[PDB]
Amino acid sequence: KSFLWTQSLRRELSGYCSNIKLQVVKDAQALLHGLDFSEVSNVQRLMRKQRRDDSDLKRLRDLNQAVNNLVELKSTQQKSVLRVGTLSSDDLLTLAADLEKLKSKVTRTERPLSSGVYMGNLSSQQLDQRRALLNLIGMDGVVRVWDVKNAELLNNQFGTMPSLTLACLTKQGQVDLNDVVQALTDLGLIYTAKYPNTSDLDRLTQSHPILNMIDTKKSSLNISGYNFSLGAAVKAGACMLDGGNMLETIKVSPQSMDGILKSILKVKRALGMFVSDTPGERNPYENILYKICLSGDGWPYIASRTSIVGRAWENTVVDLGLTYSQLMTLKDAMLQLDPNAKTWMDIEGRPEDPVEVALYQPISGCYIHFFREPTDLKQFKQDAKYSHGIDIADLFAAQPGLTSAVIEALPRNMVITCQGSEDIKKLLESQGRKDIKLIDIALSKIDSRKFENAVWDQYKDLCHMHTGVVVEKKKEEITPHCALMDCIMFDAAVSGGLNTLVLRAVLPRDMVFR
Amino acid sequence: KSFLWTQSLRRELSGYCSNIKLQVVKDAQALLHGLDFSEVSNVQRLMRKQRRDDSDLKRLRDLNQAVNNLVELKSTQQKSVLRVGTLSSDDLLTLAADLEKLKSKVTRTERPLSSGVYMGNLSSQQLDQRRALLNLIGMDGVVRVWDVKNAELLNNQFGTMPSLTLACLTKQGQVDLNDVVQALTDLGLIYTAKYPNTSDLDRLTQSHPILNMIDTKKSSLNISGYNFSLGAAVKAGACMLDGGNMLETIKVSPQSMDGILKSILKVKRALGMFVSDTPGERNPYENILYKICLSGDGWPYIASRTSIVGRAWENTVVDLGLTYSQLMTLKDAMLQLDPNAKTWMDIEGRPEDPVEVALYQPISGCYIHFFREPTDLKQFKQDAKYSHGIDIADLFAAQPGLTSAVIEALPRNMVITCQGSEDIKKLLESQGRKDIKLIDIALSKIDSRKFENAVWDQYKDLCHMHTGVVVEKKEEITPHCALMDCIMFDAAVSGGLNTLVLRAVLPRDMVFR
Amino acid sequence: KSFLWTQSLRRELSGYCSNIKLQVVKDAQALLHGLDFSEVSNVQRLMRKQRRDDSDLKRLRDLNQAVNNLVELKSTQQKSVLRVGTLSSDDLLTLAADLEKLKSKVTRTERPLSSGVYMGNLSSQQLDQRRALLNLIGMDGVVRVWDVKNAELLNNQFGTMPSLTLACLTKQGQVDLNDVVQALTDLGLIYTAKYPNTSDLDRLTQSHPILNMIDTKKSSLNISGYNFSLGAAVKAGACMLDGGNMLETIKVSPQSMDGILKSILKVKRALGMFVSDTPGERNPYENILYKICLSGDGWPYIASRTSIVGRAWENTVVDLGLTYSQLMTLKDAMLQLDPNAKTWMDIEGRPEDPVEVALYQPISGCYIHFFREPTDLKQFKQDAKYSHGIDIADLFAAQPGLTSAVIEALPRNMVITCQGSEDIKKLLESQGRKDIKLIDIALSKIDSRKFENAVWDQYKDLCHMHTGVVVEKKEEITPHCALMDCIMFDAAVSGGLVLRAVLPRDMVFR
């Protein structure tokens, strides 16, 4: 059923496939020669930890950039732009659709590994429902695997490579290289007829003892390229064979990129392939579509991709409220909120025409931040003059529907704290949520903006929306008001000071803009 | 199309599958210590030949017997009589049907290797139609691969056996046994997912270089268990798994045989499996059905069956004109004859009611010999006492429609010599054949039976139908046989009886029901 | 590669061409004066209908008569019998094999419009494999364009003639006659160099605004000559130039038909031309060989072939087991059947040697009916006396092989109703199609023949195969027809009592 998709894709794309054994074995032997395999063991030890940080990530990345200096099979950073040539106008619509579906699927699978999910003080059903997602995606009260300052540094660091695999099995398994090649050759042949299972690897193990090391019924989620998964072994086995149509052996180029995708959409239409609305393991169509859109120059499956920054939906653009798919990602990202924690909220613009919305939980250092186009532009210029200093031409790019979707998804029975309950009340009540209880702090003007300078020095990087000169009639310039910076400084006003805390965004950055 | 047929039978016969990996390696280890592999070489040399004689079969049977004596995994002579129990009445009706069609297909595929096909003086169409039968089945004027005294001695001698295969690759291929067990396992694993082919064997040889011994582009037809076919290698691989629903491991017993046949039928029913009415390689259903019905006790696929007598349709029977598939076997049987050669004919019983019919070709030595149930009980009795001495009770088990079908399939424009034409004329006539010219030679009473005693002395065993005491106007005389008349009327002409072993055109099973 | 074939044919057939720039306009003028273009717009309306019947075909055929009555460039009824002479015995065999291929292509493209294809309860893949087919040829469940009682009235009615195109562009486009000639000539000068496309005519229209009535897509299939296709304008623009060896201008005669055929087969041989076995539009080779073999008198491209009767393999014959080509015709003929509906089956003779075979679906009203040669005569000559009464000389001409070819082409899972089973079971099992379930209705022999004399009164003309006198053990009785048995047994279950052949009319007898 998932091997059927794979089979049809082999035939259709067989003309882009080739023998690569010599290039692979060369990289394996070069790793066997150059690489510090005790550091391979060190990175594996770090992947056994349930909780990992920046020191673990640096070690992984350093080992990644050590492998990358020794292999000749690498993918280069290449942007890709697609138009009506070769691909039909109908084909680019489908791609755009499937890519934004993929976007949702991959963000809901991988992001909670870094962003985290709240597993503390919740109802019995909610925990059961959160546990089911975290069982599925491979995963105080906030549980996460990667506690990092920059989660973008987790991109493309976890892919599996045939040559690295072949080298790792040879050194760590303590047998000759050829034995390993002749082992994955027999595995590679199982794969020409079925996706290999537990019993398959068992009986080969009797003739090739190496295949013990490999873990068969482990997931491909929350693993590195240094681990001995079923997928890494199967992939490495596909490249040792003498031909022919093995999908792993695809190379992409600017000259070949469109045709592969055109051929992918032909199979998809013939068999009814689709991007899953579920988080978890990638299906055959999800896997190929991501690996090709990741780079316009390289080998989608088997190359070195650790040099590549960004995602597949970013590295490839289509030139032509919230989607059900976006709604899902948003609803999963918000499970990061502790509903029992103290929560600030602030807005810029009048409550019935908001242009900036923020929420802030000071103890976890997690925040919601987003934007909206105004309706009353004639009133927007007034607030640009005297309050927020936002230019509307920079709000054009704000993703629509975000205002209602966040206020709808807010934890029920949460208590929101605000400097002036007035407008916040008329906002939540309007967006359908009267239930949310509100505190009024009621500070004075001098005491609310006491830590205004302190907050902008530490956190300026988190909002770039405020450009316009703001005045205060007596005219003289003042600091423009950010909705986010307001929240932080109002918490500091009450606290009596401001700590150094690395803030974590609840929303993905891909969601704020279009 | 047919790997599913296997995959489905695998799923339903699971409980009959088993672990024999050890017992095969044990039987190979015994062959490695006991078998003369130089004699294996000698038999393989005989299989490379086009024409094979009685001495080649003697060597082949002697070696098979030596293999047989050493292996612990053998099949036993166990006959099966099927009764309504585990199998429903319809299940049994389906079994009987298929065994008739299977009988036809396997006779048409195997028997011409011995019986032969005339390939001399014919129309271009007749030769192309015939040479296209030879490539379907993997095969003076007569073409044959086996020229033997008795073609029952060919039966069950050619099967493949994993332990023999295992033993032969080890000793002839000059590698250790352990590395042979390694190689076959990986092939056996592939066999779970697909039937391995050209490249599948090519790429496997790259780690295990014992596998270029095995021939890929060679069929299963016209080869012995000593040859390294893909099927023998694939078969042996199946045994290399401690588990897996492989049909090759199955054990049959008087207790389990019905239930096995029941399970096969469900798979056949479900998918729509069938016996193909075209000669050639066996389909998975034809294969399983044959091997199971040969012996009620033993291992259908993997045992030594070299000591088993009878074809599977004789060893297993159901208890509760010709069939379409009997006809195609009959038409295929007739191709042995030289249509241009000298050909005799003779009948016993009235031309309107023949009880015995025989045709004889004196040069190739081949004959048609069959019987028929009469209708004129009155005329029969006086003929019996004056001519053939055939007991009417011995004729009820004769195949009906055999007169029609044989006379039809006789080649157009043949020349028949006969003693007395009036009779032969009326029988060929009322059947569509006026095209055949008849030569009546003028042999008087005395001369036509000069070598009568000589013919019966030499050929008695060919006819057992004449038991009654025949008399002339009184004293006893020798009963008239259609076939013995044909031979002796030829003897009169030639001035001497020939000294040869005769070959039958008709499959022996086909004469009686 | 198809304009190559055009070009190459043009040079080799240069001397059977003339000019015709006078008579084309002459007949176009004789149309301007004496033809109502309201009925022409009425025809365009009818061809715009998604379903069409006998009354719409009447309005077409009468207009194909009225145009034929005025014009002096016409083809007339002329049969051709190809003998050796100019065409070597090797040319004849290549011409007989190609016309046979051509039969299979033209039938699979044009016939489904009338006969219909079932697009109801089927597997997605079937709905894929069958819609693919429709978009190639330009097309309850059964979808059809022409629903007519006589489908032979459809033949030679959709033809395209330049003069008819000329007179149509003039009156309907409201420009002067000359401006139509000026516009199409300029398109004809493009036809000497390449086959005009989307942009060719788009730029022509910039000087010739009258050329906007014309489509690039689509097509050249379920259109009539009253439409404005690309080809109609192209053919017209060819007959506007002086000389140049223009294919469209070819006139055939009983003295010249062999040499023109002799010419074609050289170019085919020299290039690699052949009759496509895939349905759709004609390649230039299919089109030339078809237009010529239609008639041996007139202008195969530009004449008034609207009163010509019978197809090109019928109107032209050669004088010296089914063919690969006919089996694909048969498989696309069995697509008409609704496999999810009440279906009968009946045969004559014994199951191991059937001489007449029938299947019938009442609700739609379609049937399968064919004959076979017997093998056993002793049994056939008795069945003739006491069951069917068919003469053996009538059974030689029946197409051999249809019996197994139809049975295998049956839909999988279909359920048959019969009277009785057993011998229907014996037949579908010899062929090895057990998957088919059988219902015996098992009526009494008197109850089976209640509506006997009624069915032979409404459907007699559908079978002319029963000649001999069938007797009962004696008195004369009405012979048994396998097809007439299908309809009467249906009536005995219905209590009461059109028909469309599933099998091609041309495939029953060879």
Ligand SMILES: [Mn+2]
């Ligand atoms: Mn990175």
Ligand SMILES: [Mn+2]
């Ligand atoms: Mn504010």
Ligand SMILES: [Mn+2]
């Ligand atoms: Mn191995």
Ligand SMILES: [Mn+2]
């Ligand atoms: Mn005699």
Ligand SMILES: [Mn+2]
């Ligand atoms: Mn009937």
Ligand SMILES: [Zn+2]
């Ligand atoms: Zn801001």
Ligand SMILES: [Zn+2]
């Ligand atoms: Zn005898």
Ligand SMILES: [Zn+2]
């Ligand atoms: Zn009839």
